[PDB]
Amino acid sequence: ATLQKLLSYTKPDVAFLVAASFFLIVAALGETFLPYYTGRAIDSIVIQKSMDQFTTAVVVVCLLAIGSSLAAGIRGGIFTLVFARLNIRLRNCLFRSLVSQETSFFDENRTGDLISRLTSDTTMVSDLVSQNINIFLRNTVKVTGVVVFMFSLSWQLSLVTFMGFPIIMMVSNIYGKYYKRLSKEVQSALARASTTAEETISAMKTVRSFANEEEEAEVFLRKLQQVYKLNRKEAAAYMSYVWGSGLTLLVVQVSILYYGGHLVISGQMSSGNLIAFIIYEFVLGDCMESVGSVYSGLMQGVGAAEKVFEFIDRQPTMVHDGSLAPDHLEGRVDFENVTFTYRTRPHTQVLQNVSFSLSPGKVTALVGPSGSGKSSCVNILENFYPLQGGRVLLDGKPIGAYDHKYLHRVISLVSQEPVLFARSITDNISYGLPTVPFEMVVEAAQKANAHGFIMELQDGYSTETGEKGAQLSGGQKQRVAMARALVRNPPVLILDEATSALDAESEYLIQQAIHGNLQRHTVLIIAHRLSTVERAHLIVVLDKGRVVQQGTHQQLLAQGGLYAKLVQRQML
Amino acid sequence: ATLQKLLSYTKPDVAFLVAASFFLIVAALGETFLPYYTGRAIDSIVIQKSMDQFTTAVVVVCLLAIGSSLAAGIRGGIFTLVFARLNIRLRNCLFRSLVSQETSFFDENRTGDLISRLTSDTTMVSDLVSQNINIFLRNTVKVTGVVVFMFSLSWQLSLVTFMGFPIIMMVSNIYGKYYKRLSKEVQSALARASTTAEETISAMKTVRSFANEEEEAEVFLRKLQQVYKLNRKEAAAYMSYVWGSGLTLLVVQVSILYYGGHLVISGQMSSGNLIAFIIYEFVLGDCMESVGSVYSGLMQGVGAAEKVFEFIDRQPTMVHDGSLAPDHLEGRVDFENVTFTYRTRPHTQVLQNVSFSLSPGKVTALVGPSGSGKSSCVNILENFYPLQGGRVLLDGKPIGAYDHKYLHRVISLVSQEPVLFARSITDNISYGLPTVPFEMVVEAAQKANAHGFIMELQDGYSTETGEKGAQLSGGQKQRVAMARALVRNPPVLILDEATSALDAESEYLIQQAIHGNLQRHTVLIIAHRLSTVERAHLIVVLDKGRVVQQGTHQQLLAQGGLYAKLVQRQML
């Protein structure tokens, strides 16, 4: 990220910066002409008396005071309304581009980092670019009103004052280019300190079962002391700067004296060579500010926003473009010679030449020895990850060709460890849908057998299950995750191992009777119990990522194909 | 939180502040005396030849310039250092008091709120305090100088200049009591929009299975447009305080003319009356800054830190004070007429008069109908929540009387949904322990039947399982959550649902063998499968929070007690 780019996100704020600059000029006139009009007013009363021409002249002293404060106020009241509008736009423009990246991206960036860039960084970058544009607009007017006088007093001497500027910028640039490399290693070393404060608070019930809850507060400290060594290095590099300029503004302050002598004796007056200094002390208090800091800050902002400007430009490595949304779907899924391997461990192949299909209207189970690729057959059916070789078909057309917002409304899912949100229940069984009538939420909460325990909570369908449904039992959090996938009435239904993983051994049956036997679905039951997969219309045993057997329970329990060995210890 | 409290947290910086103030005094002295010596040197060099006589006077100008530059640089450096130190101290002192609160606390405050608070509020408070202290010191020095110069001219008029200061303060106190009530409803409405950006990023694999990943980015926006409506009322005020001040500083400039002229025609030189204004213009620019902003800011800091100063003073409602660490623990647990009720739903009793015990060296199981209180018998045994009637005894003495860091080293636990951390595996099977030898991590990873699949990962025991072990299968995250509980040799082991959860029924046994049959443990197997509790030395069936049956498998399958009805559907 260069300096031009950072100033591009402030383009829609020109209508505000001009009205903020104009009201800045008017604030300068009233600050200079005031004395000239004051004496002109004091002489009036001094001529004869007051109350006769005083009011005639004292008026122009009031209007300037009033006419001034209005400007100095309406200005400060807009450079605080452009630090917000620039913030809200830098924040929103990141999220909206941080929530459309392929899923393989959230496995490499810990959710503590991604929030330290959205919360902290975009607050810094917004801050710097406000002040340093609040200043460079003030010091570009004072330098003008003070530069014209340094000519009226001297035509020669002024041309020497302007020989330091090109010097006070070669220095104000050497730090701008070093203050960036640093203010990026502080926003970074400050995020790594905010991924240990989020990983320890979100898991406080498992960091306390072990007694090191007060020792995980000394791994946070030792993460700040590394954001300190980066702060006592950002001071020594700002002290060392003030000296770098101050010295330079001295040489120009001396050389102006000696060369100011030759004139004072021969050419220039002695009264002028003294006033051209007072008016000269300002161009130093400006040549060091106007372009000393305004170009360091603008180079410390571009440092803080060096990463925030990378998540906004990153191109998702899996783009979904297709609008094949039909109106009559059968529900026939097929895996045609699949081959898969994750992006965070690319030396092991998860699936290999897997090939099977689900028939429309039948409960095709899927089993395996707890380490084969079973869920990975769900993280693909739902187009989370890309394939190396092969294609998944849904009714004859590869899933890549369906409308990304429609495919996920005809393929429900019950992930292995269901994750609920911190809302009500009636607002959690209808998560993805716009305003479904409260009638269909109950008609779909009796199928999953939730209405039994929901109508006993302190508040019924309006209770709360906060922070990943951690305020519901392990068995109630599924029957509320089941109902969340049935209220859509989906043709294809996917029940991952959370089907009945944590039920009472009598509840999982009262669901099977109603899940797909009554209506027409295409279920896909992944599980380890022999009960659930007993009556399945089919079974696909896969081991180490290779489909082995495809046969019904008895038709497969006859021959020994690694299936009859699994259910052995369970048949008692 | 008053202002004295906010300032108290900067007590250990008195040394730095006195050093900064001293260097500020020096810088002011230099900047004020420079022109007089400059004129002296110019006169001394113009009187005679300046070639050799100039230096004897320009040396003083050079020394004053060098001194001023050094002072300004050191002041800037020390203020940046003080800001950094204050920020670090506040940050650290928040966490260390935010990770020792009772567990119920973390069930009422969402983990996005806490992190937004910590980060943003600490940054804002430190920034405000630093800027404001700096400005106040500078302005007090300048005001002292100018007030001396003003008294030197008039003894009467000055006493009218100060008649406005109390006015410009009573006004700078009404935008310090309204600007606090506001800057607290911005930090408390900007952290309510950083819990919708953390709840959506940490659950990105379940907010995408439903297609509303780009509609969850328009619930974030509408959470910012309410931080705007506040950031606007915060501008329309600052723009309405400069006016309330600028005006008051006008009446003082008018009233200083009427009384200013009356003295110029009778007893005050007209030359002086003109000069007592220029010096007067640069007190309005200070009486409006020195106490204008420096007392609004200090009242906006106390606003932003209105909550951060509440998590630092909150008293944990469950304090553990007991040191009874023995050297020979038997391992006998007992529940003596327990009665329990959560604090976030205090109208339903979870447990009721529960009473049972675990015998030292026996696998006491525990079962129920998926909604009774079973885990709540573990969130109590580990002293997470307080009881209401009854005691939980560990070897005769209540658990409340054990070293909180020792009790949790003799009672291991396997939560219902295990949660791993984003580290290696050899650094995750030894979480709570300091540097256990790598020989004991393998000897304890073969018991849990994990060494089989660990030595096939791309990197072996050094691979990574990031962000809640989401980069391991559902059945590999259990066998790594067991090894984490067995590497301590706990005399009391608790398996909420670890083996039965997601194991393939083959490695399901190899754990069931070596866990407690070889050594001396006191296991407690919670589960739903008939396999675990089949060979258990005891069973305790509890329903709706009331222990019903306490008998072995056969001794309990004889009499129908809601047990024979549970395992019925699975006995095949």
Ligand SMILES: Nc1ncnc2c1ncn2[C@@H]1O[C@H](COP(=O)(O)OP(=O)(O)O)[C@@H](O)[C@H]1O
């Ligand atoms: N997000 C992921 N990134 C990398 N590897 C993964 C990820 N999820 C699972 N794996 C690996 O894939 C293999 C098979 O995983 P998975 O298909 O989930 O097994 P199961 O379906 O039995 O849970 C496992 O060895 C696991 O280490």
Ligand SMILES: Nc1ncnc2c1ncn2[C@@H]1O[C@H](COP(=O)(O)OP(=O)(O)O)[C@@H](O)[C@H]1O
């Ligand atoms: N943290 C919590 N806060 C409030 N209520 C809870 C919490 N955890 C569980 N519950 C409630 O307690 C009841 C019993 O929960 P629990 O004992 O966990 O059941 P199980 O042991 O079968 O999972 C449930 O109805 C559940 O709603």
Ligand code: BEF
């Ligand atoms: F390891 Be699994 F999700 F059966």
Ligand code: BEF
């Ligand atoms: F509802 Be549970 F944890 F058996």
Ligand SMILES: [Mg+2]
């Ligand atoms: Mg799975």
Ligand SMILES: [Mg+2]
């Ligand atoms: Mg439980």
